[PDB]
Amino acid sequence: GSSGSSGKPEPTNSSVEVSPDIYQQVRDELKRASVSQAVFARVAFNRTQGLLSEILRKEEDPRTASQSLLVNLRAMQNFLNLPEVERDRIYQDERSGPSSG
Secondary structure, eight states: OOOOOOOOOOOOOOSOOOOTTHHHHHHHHHHHHTOOHHHHHHHHHSOOHHHHHHHHHTOOOTTTOOHHHHHHHHHHHHHTTSOHHHHHHHHHHHHOOOOOO
16 A cells, blocks of 8 residues: 555674785874874774874784784774765764864
8 A cells, every 4th residue: 555665784794804004094094084093993993092003003913913902903994994974974973073173
C-alpha cells in the first residue's frame, strides 16, 4: 500500500594494515586540517599530544612497534582512512568554536 524504502549498509573490518609513512601522513593530515596533534590524536586514537608528538619524533616503526603503540598506529591509520569530509568535521567538532578571525 505504497511506501517502502531502506538501505544504509554497514562496514566490517578487523585489524587493518599500517603504512610506514603513517608518521608523515599524520603530520600532513594536521597540516591539512590545520588541527592540533591533540585534537587529531584525540580523534585518531583518543590520545594527547605529548604522546603523538613522541610518535612523530621517535616514529616507532610499525614493524617493531609494540602492540601498545601499534594499537594506536592501527587506530590512526584507521582515522586517516575516514572521508576527508568527515575528518574536516571530526576536527571541527573537537575544536568546538569557530570564532572567525
